[PDB]
């Protein structure tokens, strides 16, 4: 049993930030896809006859079991066709787990709904990189051994709004034993002295994308465990370095000067020629007046009466 | 003569916006790209020998001749090839214009660099939206007729940070001519009474972009305007609707009531049971000391000594 804790996996920040305890609505949630997740399978449980406590169960099952998003593959677990078609076809977020009376696994589906999912912010120093090396932590909450990993990356045309995550979309980009090592004392994992940790050139996406991680056991169970991160790259501002002419060394004068291990934690953008603040309102208003299907076409200046 | 006013173009936005005038090395202007323009141009003409006078000389003339980001193409402007291999083959965002000592056109290729360019931010309602139909406004300073509009969006594959625009990077969208329109009072153009506007469904692209605007007079002289526009779509927050489950529609009872024309203008993702702005301050030293080619990997748990 576990989770990735960094890049931190969706379910498992869904079940850290808390709020679904009380009320059993998960209207105590603040992240929105979190609470929509939580939602999605309380409202599922109430369609199918379920009272307000085995919908409330069978959501906070979903969130309190961060470190069971299973699926049992059997002994064939190296049978990529078998894992892909039986074992976890759909449902990818969920490791498969669609059944809120059955448990395990559960129903955990709320976690494959699309949208505004919050990603880990990984900054860019060099927006033109090809791979920014990353370093995962598998966090372990129950040993297992023998067992081995497999990353995925999704493919750049991945949309996390309106998107389920599939294999068919999946990049793999790491596939073997990570072996297991103490813990940091900086570490995000708090189970047990041990981590699984890993170095990944990932491949530089310029849209939010998703990272798939599979922990797989090598025996005749073939217990793995499938968890999803969210991710984005934040690109570094100003001038791309490439481009920059830099000014020859000069020695200048005259009487008027303006012709020549601790970090830091819009009316900056007006200048004495141009108060940007008020055009940028009336900006915004041009952008809702005359983008969409309900833009202003004809009615600011045309009239028209019944013959 | 003329510039793009929605989506405003690259050098419209920069002239506008001011602070270029004075100090003469650019550093009065707030936007960092539209200064990392001006100073490019300043620095050129410093390396060639220029003054600090011909330098704010053909740094300003390009902020000022933002109506004039034009190209002469001759008789033969329908001649495709003779458009992009010969009147505007590269600087396309600056139209060509490569030579500060001769006007027209000057140097403008400031306007080519690539980088965090502002951009026009056209919000989303529905994001799984195909386009975007965008009611363009091209204001002409000059009237002149017979003339035709192209309007071209770059492919998918663009990165605004660190490409510069290509005409193999281009698709076309539009190609014809644009009649004369009364402006509206809402009007982002103020030169004459007259605009050019017409509708054009954007491609729904997941990354910044950019517009291309050619303005072609049919005329032996062969006169043309190319504008560039930085445009992006932000993405609606919440659930994508058509993953969202309903409730059944239900009346509840019981002692305790938590078991059931104008508009508006992280402390809230703290819960009881979590404290979301510690842990976060953590988490984002964590993507620092784990994440590129600087990260720890073995100096936090490993000594070593010169035997
Ligand atoms: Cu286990
Ligand atoms: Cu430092
Ligand atoms: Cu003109
Ligand atoms: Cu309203």
């Not at 679904?20 to 599922?44: E, H, L």
């Not at 793999?172 to 050139?201: E, W």
């Amino acid at each position: 049993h576990g989770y990735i804790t960094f890049p931190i996996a969706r379910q498992r920040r869904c079940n850290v930030q808390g709020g679904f305890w009380w009320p059993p609505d998960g209207s105590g949630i603040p992240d929105p896809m979190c609470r929509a997740a939580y939602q999605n399978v309380y409202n599922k449980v109430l369609q199918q006859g379920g009272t307000i406590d085995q919908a409330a169960s069978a959501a906070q099952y979903m969130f309190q079991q961060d470190n069971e998003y299973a699926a049992l593959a059997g002994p064939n677990y190296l049978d990529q066709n078998h894992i892909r078609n039986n074992v976890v076809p759909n449902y990818l977020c969920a490791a498969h787990a669609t059944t809120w009376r059955i448990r395990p696994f559960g129903d955990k589906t709320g976690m494959d709904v699309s949208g505004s999912w919050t990603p880990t912010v990984i900054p860019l120093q060099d927006n033109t990189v090809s791979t920014v090396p990353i370093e995962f932590e598998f966090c372990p909450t129950a040993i297992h051994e023998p067992s081995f990993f497999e990353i995925y990356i999704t493919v750049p045309s991945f949309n996390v709004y309106t998107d389920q995550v599939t294999w068919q979309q999946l990049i793999n980009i790491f596939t073997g034993p990570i072996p297991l090592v103490q813990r940091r004392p900086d570490s995000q994992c708090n189970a047990n002295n041990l981590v699984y940790r890993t170095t990944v050139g990932i491949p530089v996406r310029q849209t939010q994308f998703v990272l798939y991680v599979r922990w797989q056991r090598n025996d005749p169970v073939g217990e793995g465990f499938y968890n999803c991160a969210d991710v984005i790259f934040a690109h570094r501002l100003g001038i791309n370095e490439e481009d920059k002419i830099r000014p020859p060394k000069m020695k200048c004068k005259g009487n008027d000067k303006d012709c020549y291990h601790y970090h830091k934690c819009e009316r900056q953008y007006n200048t004495k020629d141009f108060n940007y603040v008020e055009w940028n309102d009336d900006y915004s208003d041009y952008i809702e007046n005359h983008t969409g299907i309900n833009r202003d076409m004809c009615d600011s200046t045309t009239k028209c009466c019944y013959k």
